[PDB]
Design a protein around this ligand. Sequence first.
Ligand code: NA
Length: 457
Amino acid sequence: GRLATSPLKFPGKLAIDTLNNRLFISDSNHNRIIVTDLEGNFIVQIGSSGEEGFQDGSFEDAAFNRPQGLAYNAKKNLLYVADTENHALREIDFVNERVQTLAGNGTKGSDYQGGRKGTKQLLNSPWDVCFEPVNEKVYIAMAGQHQIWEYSVLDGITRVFSGNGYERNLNGSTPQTTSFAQPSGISLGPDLKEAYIADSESSSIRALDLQTGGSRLLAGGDPYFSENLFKFGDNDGVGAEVLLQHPLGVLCANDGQIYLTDSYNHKIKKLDPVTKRVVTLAGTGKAGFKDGKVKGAQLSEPAGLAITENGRLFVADTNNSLIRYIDLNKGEDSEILTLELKGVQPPTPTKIVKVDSVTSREGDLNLKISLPDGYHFSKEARSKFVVDVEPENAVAIDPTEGTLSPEGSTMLHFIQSSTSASVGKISCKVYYCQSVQFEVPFKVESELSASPTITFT
Ligand code: NA
């Protein structure tokens, strides 16, 4: 059946180019973007090896790491990518067939304000993107920090747009009097005045004001206890009668109506943002795979949506690893069907290790390199390391070079020289019977000593 033959693995998100009839698939756990026509015929992929990585360049060289949201720039023929586990915003240029990084730098940030340019601005688990084509802004659902961010296409400034960073369903009128709760989907309204948000961990749909940074609650969740993350269930109705569970995807159609994936209830739902009425569109609520009449069909953790001008709604049916679609024009005779992918192959494939940032002024790095079963480190070729700090002298790292222990381990003492951020690079030549570079971000946020573990197998 369709499940056994799918070349996808947990596709999370979709975008569409309705002018040139292209579907963009975030094949998330294959670390690649697939481009097909609207009938599922393969056109091109970016990330054909399927390997996790963080690499700019040609379509042959580029690498992603569990990417999620996509947004298409019709004016420039570019695809924006929320490259979640690289904490980066990427750009796929179809004119020149190149990938480049717009913002973020591969390391998870803890910057709740931003305002830096391009790759000097760190991000935190960006999950979804949408492109506002008049003011040329990419809005980012920054799931890791419970915020919405704004990337300025014309100058690269990347900044917080809304949300104080606390996880709650709080709908104030200014960016610092709003909060989100794992926002994982974002879609612009027809007038480009609001963005609709899938606020996954409050189990609600919200509307963000693109002029003020304030937000309002449309349906789902607890309108009276902002801290309540347990107001979930599966109930159609109006406003506060509505229960959802962990919606990951949201889409605003040209007529202003909202489609959403009520992900943990295995349903597609329709929200009228004017009346706040939510009705089930497709799915019984039981996890599964069944095509046909929409009310009797089954999905499994659907998470992304895209729509054609003619009313064909595509769904990334994530846990089934399938793309499905519904023709909305059919009304109550609507059916959900599976996009049969054609010509889409499964993936056919110095190591870099991004390390979690070190937050203590002083401490020790516990470096351990593991081997597979059967292998052991060489004897007449001890594995040696060398240490460099990206701004020289920014961190004093006491053994700047040496040999690894018989277990492939070593301990390095460090102290940061100031209050600014830096990067330490530990380059290792390991002989077993490879070349691995650990990239360690450093920034001072505590005066207590830390002792992180740095690992590679
Ligand atoms: Na999507």
